Amino acid sequence: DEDETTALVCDNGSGLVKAGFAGDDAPRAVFPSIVGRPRHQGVMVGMGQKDSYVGDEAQSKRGILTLKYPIEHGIITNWDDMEKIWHHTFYNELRVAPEEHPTLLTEAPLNPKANREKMTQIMFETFNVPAMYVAIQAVLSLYASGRTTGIVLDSGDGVTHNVPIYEGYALPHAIMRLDLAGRDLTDYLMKILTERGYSFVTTAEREIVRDIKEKLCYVALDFENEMATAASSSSLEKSYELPDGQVITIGNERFRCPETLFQPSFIGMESAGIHETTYNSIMKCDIDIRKDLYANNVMSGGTTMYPGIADRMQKEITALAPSTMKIKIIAPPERKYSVWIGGSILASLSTFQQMWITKQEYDEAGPSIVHRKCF
C-alpha cells in the first residue's frame, strides 16, 4: 500500500492470528488460529450452517460445533484451515489481497519445515503474494518492543518462543521453541475443570476452556494463595457460560493455566517451563552476553495476557541469571500481537525488502525458500 513494502502480515500463531500490514503499531485484525466445523452441519434446529469457521467463528456453537487449530504451537498444522486463516488475514481481514501485497506469516522459531512450506507455498500458490516474509513469531515480538536484541519471548495463546540475540540468533539449539503455551494452559484448565467436575472432552469444549482461560486466567505469581482464594468463586474462580445453558466455575484453574507455561508440574510429566528455556536461549549468549540479553526480556504471546506475566517471567529470569546480572521484561504496548506489530514494522522500513520470501523466491527455491529466507 504505502511507499513502504507495506507488507501484509499474518501474525498467525496457534491460538490467534492477526491480519495487517506495515506502517502500523498494533494488529489490524485478531481471529483465533482455531478454525471451526460443526458436529451436525447440514441443517439443525440450532446451528448457523457453515463449514470452515475461520477464527473466532469456530467458537460459536461449540455445543453443536467442533473447533480445530490450523496452527498448533507455531506448527502451522492445518494449512487448509491455515489457508482459511490466510484468506481471512489478507483476503478477508486485511481485505487486501495476499496476492497483491507482500504478506508476512508468523511462525514458531524452529518450526517444522512443513509449516514454513505451507506459509510460503500458500502465499505463493493459494494467496499468490508477491513477496511474503515467514517472520519469526518471537523476533517480531522483539521488533515491536522497539528492540532488535535481547531475550525475545512470545508466550502463550498461540505459541511460546524465546529468541536470543547474540553471537547467535536462531539455531535448533539456541532458540526456545516452547510448545508450552496458552494451548497447554487451555488443556490444563480443561483437565482441572474436569477435576472439579466440569467435564470437557470435545475440542469444542476445549475451546470453551480456552476462552475461559484467556479471560479466566492469571499468571500465578503466587498460585497457591489465589488457589485457596479460588477453591470457591472468590475473585479467581470465575464462571463462563456457553449460551446453551452452561456455566463453568473455574477454580484455582484460572491461574493453573499460566503456571503450566512457567511451572509445568501442573500436568504431571517430565518437561520444561517458559522462563527456563527462555534463559536457555539467553545462555547460549556469553557471560557478558547473557548479561546483555537480560536488559531486553522482550515478551509477547497469549500467556503474556494473564495477570503477572511480566512479574512472573522477570522474577524467574532475574533468578535465571548470575546475580551479577539483573533482567528486565520489555512489555510492548501490545504483547500477544507484538508479533503482528514487529512483523508490520519490519514491513514498514526497508527491512521487509530484505526479509520476504518472494512469490518467485518460493516458485524457484520451492517452499524450502522459507529456510532459505527465514526460519
Binding site: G23, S145, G146, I330, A331, S348
Partner: protein, 607 residues
C-alpha cells in the same frame, strides 16, 4: 559583466540564456507602467529586450491571444524580486486586461508574512513558502479573477525554526504584536517562553512583530477575518506555540500514556477551546490507526510529544491555510471567466543558506524541481532556437541537469532518498534518526547527487548535490518536525474545540511524515509553475538586503544559479548558445576565409 554593467547602467533587466534576469533593485522599476504594459502587450519574451513585461506578454498573449493559461516563473531568494516581478506581471495584465483581485494579494502578503512567511537569511519578510498568484483572464484575456496560494508552509518552522529564520512571523507577531489582552486570550507565553520562536529574531529584521502583527489582523480582515476570527487564528499561533511546551511523560519500556501536568495543554486547549484533558490524555492515549482496528497501542510518549509537535505543526499549517483561504475569499473575485490564467511565482528559490535541514532540504529540493521546469523550458526555447534554423543539433534536455539532485530527496524505499529516509524513520513506532543516517549513508549511492560526507562527517551529516550547487545537509533534527503523529483524537478535539474558529481550522482531524508533506508542497508549486508555458522572469539579487542600483555580479550569478539562470546560460551553452546570422556570418567572415564570397553575398547557406 553584461549583467553587472547593465544593471549599473540601469539594466536590471538583462536577458540570460533565454531569461528575463531581473537583477532585482527591489524597487518595482517603472518598466511595469501602462506604457510598458502596452509596449509589451503584443510583445512576448524575446520580442523585446529583457522584461517581466516581455514575459508578462508571453503569459498574457498566451492567455488572451493563445488562449493558454500561463505561469510567470519568478524564482530565487524569497522577496528577491518575487513581489517585484510578480506585481510587475500583475500590473502588466491589470492594464493589458481588466489586476483588481491581486490587490488583496498585497494585503494577503502581510498575513502571508504572518503565518506563511517565516524569516530567512537573504530576506526578513521572506516567504518561507512559495506562493503563486493566478490572475484569471477572460477569453479576451481580462483580469476577472486573481487567486493566490501558498505551498511550502514550513509547519516545521511553525514549530522548530531555522537559523536567521524566525517562525511564521505571526508567532512573533503574536507575542509582541498581539496585545497582552490577546497575549492572554492567546495565553501568549513569551517568544521563547513558547517552545517555538526559539529563533533569536523576535521581530522580523527591518520590521516588527507589532506592526506586521497589525498587518496580520487588519489584512486578515481585508481578506475577511474578524478580529475574533483573527483572534482565534492568533490563539492558534499561540497554542501551536503552547504545544511544544506540552510534554507527555515517558517510561522505560515501550509504553503508552503519561502527562499529568497538562498546564501547557491547559493553555493550548483554552486557546483552541478544546479540552485540556481530552487533548492531554488522548496524546497520552491516542488510538494508533493500524488497520481494520484503530488500536489503543497508545502512542509511546515518544510519539506522544511527537503528536504534540504534530498538533502544533499541522495546527498552524491549517491555520495559515484557512488564513490564505480567507485571503483568496476576499482576494479573488468570485466572478471570473478565468478561461486563461497566469500563475506568477513568489518562492524562496535555490536557497544558498547556512542551515540546511528538514525545512531547508524541502525548500532547496522544491527549488530543484522548480528550476527543473525553468531549465526544461530553457531547453524548450533552446530547441525552439535549433528548429528555427536548420540545426542538426538539438542539445540535451537541459532541466535534466537537475534530476539526480531531485530523486536524491524523493526515493521512499528501495533503499530510499534523503527526505524519505527521514520518512522511513518516521514510519517507525519510535524515532530512528540513527536509522535515518544509516539510510543516508547506505543510500548515498542509491541517490545520484547524495554527497555522503567523510568517514566522520557522514555519521549524522551528509550533503545533497542540489542544483543550487551542492547543499550540505545534517539530517538529524528532521524527524521531530517530520514524525508528525498528528493526534487525530487531539486534532478532532481541535475540531471538538469550543473556540469555534479553531475548529474551523482543524475541523480536519500518525504516520504520513512531514517530509512527504513538504514534497507535496513542492509538487503543488511545481505544477503551478509548469502547467503552462513557463514564463521566463527571473528574480536576481544584486543584493539580497533589498537594494537598488547597487550590484556585484557575484550576487547576480548567485541568484542566476539560484534561479538556475547561470545554469540556464550554461544550458544555452549546453545547447547552441550563440547564433551567427547568415548575413552576420557573411559580414563577419568575408574577411575571414570567404575569398570568393564578398560580404553581403548571395547564398545564405553557401556563402
Amino acid at each position: 559583466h553584461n549583467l553587472r554593467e547593465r544593471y549599473f547602467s540601469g539594466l536590471i533587466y538583462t536577458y540570460s540564456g533565454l531569461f528575463c534576469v531581473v537583477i532585482n533593485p527591489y524597487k518595482q522599476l517603472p518598466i511595469y507602467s501602462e506604457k510598458i504594459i502596452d509596449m509589451y502587450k503584443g510583445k512576448k519574451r524575446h520580442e523585446m529586450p529583457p522584461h517581466i513585461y516581455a514575459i508578462a506578454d508571453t503569459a498574457y498573449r498566451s492567455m488572451l491571444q493563445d488562449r493558454e493559461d500561463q505561469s510567470i516563473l519568478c524564482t530565487g531568494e524569497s522577496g528577491a524580486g518575487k513581489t517585484e516581478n510578480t506585481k510587475k506581471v500583475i500590473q502588466y495584465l491589470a492594464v493589458v486586461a481588466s489586476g483588481e483581485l491581486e490587490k488583496q494579494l498585497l494585503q494577503a502578503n502581510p498575513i502571508l508574512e504572518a503565518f506563511g512567511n517565516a524569516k530567512t537569511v537573504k530576506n526578513d519578510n521572506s516567504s518561507r513558502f512559495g506562493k503563486f498568484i493566478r490572475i484569471n483572464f477572460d477569453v479576451t484575456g481580462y483580469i476577472v479573477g486573481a487567486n493566490i496560494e501558498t505551498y511550502l508552509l514550513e509547519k516545521s518552522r511553525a514549530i522548530r525554526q531555522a537559523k536567521d529564520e524566525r517562525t511564521f512571523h505571526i508567532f512573533y507577531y503574536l507575542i509582541a504584536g498581539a496585545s497582552e489582552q490577546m497575549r492572554n486570550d492567546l495565553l501568549l507565553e513569551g517568544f521563547n517562553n513558547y517552545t517555538f520562536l526559539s529563533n533569536g529574531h523576535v521581530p522580523i529584521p527591518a520590521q516588527q512583530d507589532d506592526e506586521m502583527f497589525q498587518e496580520t489582523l487588519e489584512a486578515m480582515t481585508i481578506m475577511g477575518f474578524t478580529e475574533e476570527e483573527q483572534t482565534s487564528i492568533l490563539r492558534v499561533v499561540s497554542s501551536v506555540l503552547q504545544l511544544g511546551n506540552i510534554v507527555f511523560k515517558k517510561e522505560r519500556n515501550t509504553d503508552q500514556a503519561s502527562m499529568p501536568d497538562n498546564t501547557a495543554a491547559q493553555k493550548v486547549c483554552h486557546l483552541m477551546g478544546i479540552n485540556v484533558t481530552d487533548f492531554t490524555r488522548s496524546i497520552l492515549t491516542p488510538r494508533i490507526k493500524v488497520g481494520r482496528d484503530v488500536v489503543q497501542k497508545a502512542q509511546t510518549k515518544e510519539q506522544a510529544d511527537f503528536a504534540i509537535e504534530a498538533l502544533a505543526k499541522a495546527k498552524f499549517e491549517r491555520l495559515f491555510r484557512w488564513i490564505l483561504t480567507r485571503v483568496n475569499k476576499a482576494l479573488d473575485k468570485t466572478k471570473r471567466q478565468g478561461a486563461s490564467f497566469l500563475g506568477i511565482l513568489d518562492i524562496a528559490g535555490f536557497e544558498i543558506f547556512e542551515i540546511n535541514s528538514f525545512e531547508q532540504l524541502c525548500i532547496n529540493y522544491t527549488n530543484e524541481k522548480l528550476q527543473q521546469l525553468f531549465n526544461h523550458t530553457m531547453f524548450i526555447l533552446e530547441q525552439e532556437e535549433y528548429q528555427r534554423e536548420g540545426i542538426e543539433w538539438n542539445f540535451i534536455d537541459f532541466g535534466l541537469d537537475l534530476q539526480p539532485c531531485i530523486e536524491l530527496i524523493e526515493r521512499p524505499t528501495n533503499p530510499p532518498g534523503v527526505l524519505a529516509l527521514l520518512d522511513e524513520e518516521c514510519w517507525f513506532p519510535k524515532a530512528t534518526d540513527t536509522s535515518f543516517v544509516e539510510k543516508l549513508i547506505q543510500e548515498q549511492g542509491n541517490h545520484a547527487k547524495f554527497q555522503k560526507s567523510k568517514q566522520l562527517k557522514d555519521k549524522t551529516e551528509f550533503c545533497i548535490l542540489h542544483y543550487a550547487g551542492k547543499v550540505t545537509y545534517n539530517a538529524s533534527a528532521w524527524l521531530t518536525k517530520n514524525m508528525d503523529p498528528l493526534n487525530d483524537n487531539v486534532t478532532s478535539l481541535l475540531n471538538q474545540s469550543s473556540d469555534k474558529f479553531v475548529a474551523d481550522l482543524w475541523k480536519d482531524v500518525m504516520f504520513r511524515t512531514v517530509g512527504q508533506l513538504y514534497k507535496e508542497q513542492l509538487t503543488k508549486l511545481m505544477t503551478t509553475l509548469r502547467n503552462t508555458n513557463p514564463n521566463f522572469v527571473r528574480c536576481i539579487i544584486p543584493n539580497h538586503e533589498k537594494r537598488a542600483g547597487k550590484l556585484d555580479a557575484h550576487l547576480v550569478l548567485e541568484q542566476l544559479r539560484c534561479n538556475g539562470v547561470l545554469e540556464g546560460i550554461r544550458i544555452c551553452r549546453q545547447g547552441f548558445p550563440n547564433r551567427i546570422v547568415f548575413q552576420e556570418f557573411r559580414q563577419r567572415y568575408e574577411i575571414l576565409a570567404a575569398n570568393a564570397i564578398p560580404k553581403g553575398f548571395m547564398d545564405g547557406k553557401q556563402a
